[PDB]
């Protein structure tokens, strides 16, 4: 939601197979093409929902 | 979560373009059960009682 | 906090049906090998 | 006593192993986490 309340999607942070997910990107990103190299760190790329666009644009 | 939020703002259940494809998924699995049951009913005798009936079809 | 015998119920609910269905496959491969007499009996 | 005129061979193909494993492993993906809660 871009409200700085992060949502835990992965298994290693206490999720099931059913409750776990790969989240979508941040609302603050919007439509912006957000690759790895346009983050300042992969810490930040993974905070804002970077790996959604990596999986979706390569799924499609 | 994606389906419920898209029910609220959007009302997909009252959308006939959604009604048409649930008639394509009901009728899809309707006819798959039909065409599967009309073929496997009318099968010609090759096997015995003690063998799977799938061995009455050799490949090719 | 996670429930307790679920570590048992999953892993014995996988492996005991998984290892069972392996052996109906191992049975035939030996039975079809015993049928056609080769180097194996 | 005596040998039966009943007893027979029991078979399972290679594909039927793969169906049968993937049945058990995928039901174990489903009904795992419900057992864990």
């Amino acid at each position: 939601d871009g409200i700085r309340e992060p949502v835990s999607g992965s298994l290693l942070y206490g999720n099931n197979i059913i409750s776990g997910a790969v989240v979508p990107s941040s609302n603050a990103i919007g439509m912006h093409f957000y690759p790895i190299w346009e983050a300042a760190s992969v810490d930040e790329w993974l905070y804002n929902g970077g790996p959604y666009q990596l999986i979706v644009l390569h799924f499609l | 979560n994606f389906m419920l939020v898209f029910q609220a703002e959007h009302n997909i259940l009252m959308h006939p373009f959604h009604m048409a494809g649930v008639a394509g998924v009901f009728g899809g699995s309707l006819f798959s059960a039909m065409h599967g049951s009309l073929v496997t009913s009318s099968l010609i005798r090759e096997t015995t009682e003690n063998e799977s009936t799938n061995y009455g079809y050799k490949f090719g | 906090e996670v429930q307790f015998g679920a570590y048992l119920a999953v892993l014995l609910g996988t492996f005991l049906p998984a290892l069972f269905l392996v052996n109906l496959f191992i049975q035939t491969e030996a039975r079809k090998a015993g049928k056609a007499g080769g180097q194996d009996s | 006593t005596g040998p039966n005129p009943n007893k027979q061979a029991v078979e399972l193909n290679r594909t039927s192993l793969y169906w049968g494993l993937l049945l058990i492993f995928v039901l174990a993906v489903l009904f795992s986490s419900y057992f864990f809660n």
Binding site: - | - | - | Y18, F25, V26, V29
Partner: peptide, 30 residues
């Protein structure tokens, strides 16, 4: 410790699919 059980089963299905594609019983015309 159940994330072990989750990743064992998910990789478990991924193994079974790998054997099911590449080590399948081939059909023959004969």
């Amino acid at each position: 410790m159940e994330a072990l059980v989750y990743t064992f089963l998910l990789i478990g299905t991924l193994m079974v699919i790998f054997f099911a594609v590449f080590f399948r019983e081939t059909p023959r015309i004969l």
